[PDB]
């Protein structure tokens, strides 16, 4: 499926790798959504920053 | 008091340099080791210092044989 | 547990396996002498000669001349010329040596 992604927490203070995972999804600011196809890689980063971001499975 | 201790030698950076399934050129260092932690095999030559290197080009092939120790193979493309 | 025999066998045969050329296994029984060439990377016995099969007699060494030439001839029929002579646990002398000669004498390369 596709994945509406809602950045819902600041990345400050978290390790730079997790931030780069945010950049991999293109998420740049708070309250930023991005519907992105549920791929094992993209879902990889998404799982990596699940605590920082909201995942809403969309089409 | 004093200190008998406090001295140590430089780091050697020993160990494997190329991993299995990793294309390489002949004459390249593979296992900067001490003794034979890996014994060379197919197309794998070993310098005087036990260093393993690709005799030929091709692919790195790690292969243990249990009682026969761990071998390395460069199987060409 | 190994023996001087066994350890010696693995010794020479490892020394020759390290080369890569075809090994020429050599069996020397009390009443027979056997021989063959094999591709270790295939574990496949290519050509097989033997005093047992060749049905020879006389000096066992001379019989090794016999089977040595024979195996050399069959091998040449197979084209294999450069080949490693596995003397195995045997001392390179007598029956084994003269057999290797008969393979050379048979026209084989080593």
């Amino acid at each position: 499926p596709r994945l509406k992604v809602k950045l819902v927490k600041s990345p400050i203070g978290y390790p730079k790798d997790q931030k780069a995972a945010l950049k991999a999804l293109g998420l740049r600011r708070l309250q930023q959504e991005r519907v992105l196809e549920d791929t094992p890689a993209i879902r990889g980063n998404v799982e990596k920053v699940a605590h920082l971001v909201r995942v809403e499975v969309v089409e | 008091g004093s200190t008998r201790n406090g001295r140590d030698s430089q780091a050697k950076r020993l160990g494997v340099k190329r991993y299995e399934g990793q294309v390489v050129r002949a004459g390249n260092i593979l296992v900067r080791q001490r003794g034979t932690r890996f014994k060379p095999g197919k197309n794998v030559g070993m310098g005087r210092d036990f260093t393993l290197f690709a005799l030929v080009d091709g692919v790195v092939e790690f292969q243990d044989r249990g009682r026969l120790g761990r071998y390395v193979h460069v199987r060409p493309l | 547990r190994l023996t001087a025999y066994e350890r010696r066998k693995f010794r020479v045969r490892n020394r020759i396996k390290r080369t890569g050329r075809l090994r020429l296994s050599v069996f020397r029984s009390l009443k027979h002498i056997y021989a063959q060439i094999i591709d270790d990377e295939k574990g496949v016995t290519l050509v097989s000669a033997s005093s047992l099969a060749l049905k020879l007699k006389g000096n066992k060494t001379e019989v090794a001349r016999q089977v040595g030439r024979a195996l050399a001839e069959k091998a040449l029929a197979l084209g294999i010329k450069q080949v490693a002579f596995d003397r195995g646990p045997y001392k390179y002398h007598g029956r084994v040596k003269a057999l290797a000669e008969g393979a050379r004498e048979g026209g084989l390369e080593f």
């Binding site: - | 008091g1 004093s2 200190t3 201790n5 | -």
Partner: protein, 141 residues
């Protein structure tokens, strides 16, 4: 008192205490045991003191089982010296103990005697403990 008669390294690092009692966490030899309940070291002076207390309270019969040994070399520098300039001297031999460790086993003793003696030994030791008994749990161990 209790101390390793020889060791490959006189001095030694401190190390972390986190985790549980790896081995020796069930009544194995004696009838009753005084398990630890909080990670901490114990000096051989402390261990031997607690043993002497136990043997006092029993005073007849019974058999103390010291299922811990103070092998780790406790270390402290001479007093009033600036930091550094080497590692301190071997101040004594302690034994690391985590929760779950069956420290002391008393056998050949009535229930009340062993319970009380182990209680006193608990007061002599620097850690909260828990007198216990051998059970099928221990029997399964």
């Amino acid at each position: 008192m209790l101390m390793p008669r020889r060791m490959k390294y006189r001095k030694q690092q401190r190390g972390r205490l986190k985790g549980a009692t790896k081995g020796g966490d069930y009544v194995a030899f004696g009838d009753y045991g005084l398990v630890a309940l909080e990670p901490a070291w114990i000096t051989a002076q402390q261990i031997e003191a607690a043993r002497v207390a136990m043997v006092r309270h029993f005073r007849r019969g019974g058999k103390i089982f010291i299922r811990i040994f103070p092998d780790k070399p406790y270390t402290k520098k001479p007093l009033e010296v600036r930091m550094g300039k080497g590692k301190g001297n071997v101040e004594g031999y302690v034994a690391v103990v985590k929760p779950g460790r069956v420290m002391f086993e008393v056998a050949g003793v009535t229930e009340e005697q062993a319970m009380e003696a182990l209680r006193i030994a608990g007061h002599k030791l620097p850690i909260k403990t828990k007198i216990v008994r051998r059970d099928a749990y221990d029997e399964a161990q």
